[model samples]
Target: MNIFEMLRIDEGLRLKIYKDTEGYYTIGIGHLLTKSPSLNAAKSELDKAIGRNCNGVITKDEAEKLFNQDVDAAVRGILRNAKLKPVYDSLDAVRRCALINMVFQMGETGVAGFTNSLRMLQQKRWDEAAVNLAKSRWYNQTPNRAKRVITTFRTGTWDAYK
Candidate 1:
């Protein structure tokens, strides 16, 4: 299944646009925990945010707000549901998706910034891979998220990937 399919995007609850106390437009799914504007401008900002965090492969900028927790949960779910194709494989599904999630969160350039680290993973050099994972602009920008992904790589567990 595709990542969107794995995340059950069709089942996602719909939200409407509204303003928060802070005057920022917002919308959310299910509950109010996550909100964003329901407009093109909002989507544009989000797309920019995602693009800034991941590489430039994804470029859908719309104000379709999603819960941060939900996004993370969906990433984990996709990882669990993912199946590797013959040409693409990794040591663990969780690590693979964790990298995807990080890339999604950080952007392609952000992920690519860890050239040595990615090369290490491609080489199965786990130690250097983990170390290089922690060395990037995204790492400095979001220490908690970076640390979490790095820990996931080290333990070979899906816990940190979530």
Candidate 2:
């Protein structure tokens, strides 16, 4: 099974992952936790506003396709927008991918919330980044996921076959 399939998502559901507040497309958890159609519809509308080049809400089957198309572009966009291209030149692909994945999931501003953490990374202050990464609300909220992603960054191991 593909990665998205493994994640048990659906297309319609995927489209509904975002919500619109005022004019901005905000990332939302959608109906997965609450089973609300309004939230689902909001996610769909936000996905459309973000120009996600996929059909329907994101389901597990659709996630694979969306990930394939979106992941690379998302990473590149994050790097460009975050001014990390020069930093990318110094790091291995695994580190780059790890940061990209985190930024992709969290949004540029969300990731940049770790301003001192990023500065540490830019300075190759690995220990400081590790500490800062673990100390944030992002880490506290999603400890296991954060650990997994951070491990990838530290180890430079891209397990593409997983």
Candidate 3:
């Protein structure tokens, strides 16, 4: 599946602000508005972007714009990573989308943290890479999504999109 469709299904749209599982203020589609700035600061920025006193709400267009920006950032970060570059280049399109999907969910460093899995992927050991990823707390945190991604990695197919 394409990165956009995969992420749209995985991250779901949220026009209103909410807290993520980690208690950080998030908006749009999985856009973390904490850490880089305080929630208050982020809200103000959001207001400016939407050109109104948003009051925690954004339009679908704004949300999709943000989602695209976030996805672009994830793609750039993943490709720039030294450890991940070779493995990413070695993958086919479907498997590449799986890698991009992982980065979209967890960020570049988080996905890179799957050390053994990355190694196995580099070696073209699909099942072993899947096993390594499945053992993580991320897998437990979002078992269904994780399973789909792991299956994508193992099978080199787009069955998850189906």
Candidate 4:
């Protein structure tokens, strides 16, 4: 089976934004509660789309479509937000990809707290920004991953990605 079909079978096709076993809001394949800031804010939108009177459930197709829309909004959030858009656009594609991935996992607000890192990035201080990223708790949460991304942020190389 294709990867998507595999995921659909594994994660199940839930229509409602119900909490998973760990009590985290989740719906559709394996999209988690903390995937993006826009998704977190769109709980009401999802509810409204599902309807206020009936049970909070939608078709698997709708859930999948919403997932796509959510993905779009998540990327837009980081690239369009006035606070970061200007500087974010200045970065090269690889760094922008790194930034987008970082913000994707952390969300707008989560990344917003990195005031120093943001400034370092805006000021074009790659080394300092990379160092600051590693110093944050986000790095400790997933040491290998954080180290890799930080290395990409520092060296702009994707050798470790292979």
Candidate 5:
């Protein structure tokens, strides 16, 4: 991380332009309602607070960047588990990515709460681990997402949301 990222925590995404906690119009990455800090940005992003019902939105590139930051933060918490570390390290690229996505939806606390799944995973019992995941409420709450992860865990395949 850069020195600036360490100093400032992003509060949230104001994707559609809204008032900041301090009442200034703000958008992605806490950009202010006024002009862009650098002359290089699109003129529209600058002076946004001055406009009413501002007519545009941030680009998809910015949105994806935002999600990646959130993913890194979420996954970081789960990685502290020394017991679970081996399961995470055992996977190839796609399975590793799948696990990250599953863990992202279920916070570290939630994933760790899956005692049976973790127990099976610790021993490298992939199918059993996936079955344990299926027996939980997460399967019903997020059918497709949960299934994709479970399938990947069971068969060592790859499946993820688009």
Candidate 6:
């Protein structure tokens, strides 16, 4: 599967506003309505995207549109970062999706903090890269999702869908 399908499986489709695991006001496949440093801005963007005030519910098409925007932003963020783009360009689809998936959950800066893992990934040391990812706080906080991402990094396969 592609990034969209993988994200749909991992993040899930939520048409209604709900609290994320970290208690952020989230909606539509993990879009944070109240993210750090920009609560009002996020809400404003949400309102503009849906073309109405964000009530409790959103349409599936709206949610998909939001998801597409988010995924595009994540992809562009990774590609824009000099440190990430080179390694990102060198990887296969599954491995690339793993990086995008991490950036989906956490921002590019957060993934950039994985210095050792990034190094291993850049060096194409798949096993070491996976091991380094397993040793992170992200792994502890989201073990199941982490497992899928780590395994994707290790094997360069779309096994996460299974």
Give lDDT tens digits, candidate 5, residues 75-111: 5765777655666776665556556655555556667
TM-score of 3: 0.89
> What RMSD does each model have against the real structure?
11.0, 6.8, 2.1, 6.6, 11.2, 2.3
Descending-lDDT candidate ranking: 6, 3, 4, 5, 2, 1
Candidate 4 clashes between residue pairs 3 or more apart in a chain or in different chains:
none
Task: Determine which window of 10 residues in candidate 5 has minimal summed lDDT.
Answer: 1-10
Across 8-108, the per-residue lDDT of candidate 6 in tens digits comes to 88888888767688767778998878755455555676687788987467888889888989999999999999888988998887799999999999899
Q: lDDT per residue, candidate 4, 1-162, as tens digits? A: 222332344346676676654455666754564433454454755565545532445677767876566556667898778777865777776666667656655678888788898888888898988888888888876677677667767776664454
What does candidate 1's lDDT look like per residue over 21-98, in tens digits? 334543343222224444556545534544443221221222233444546654554345323221025557656655
Measured against the true structure, the TM-scores of the candidates, in listed sequence, are 0.48, 0.62, 0.89, 0.62, 0.58, 0.91
The residue pairs that clash in candidate 5, if any, are 34-47
Reference-based TM-score, model 4: 0.62
Residue 23 error, candidate 2, Å: 20
Candidate 5: where are CA atoms >4 Å away? 1-57, 159-162
> For candidate 2, what is the lDDT?
0.55
The Cα local distance difference test for each model comes to: 0.49, 0.55, 0.83, 0.65, 0.57, 0.86
Single out the weakest 10-residue window by summed lDDT for candidate 2: 3-12
Which residue runs of candidate 4 sit more than 4 Å off their true CA positions? 1-30, 34-67
The per-prediction tally of clashing pairs is 13, 17, 0, 0, 1, 0
What's the TM for model 5? 0.58
Off by over 4 Å in 3: 35-42, 48-52
Over 23-81, each residue of candidate 3 has an lDDT whose tens digit, in order, gives: 77788888776654466876876787667798788889889888888888888888899
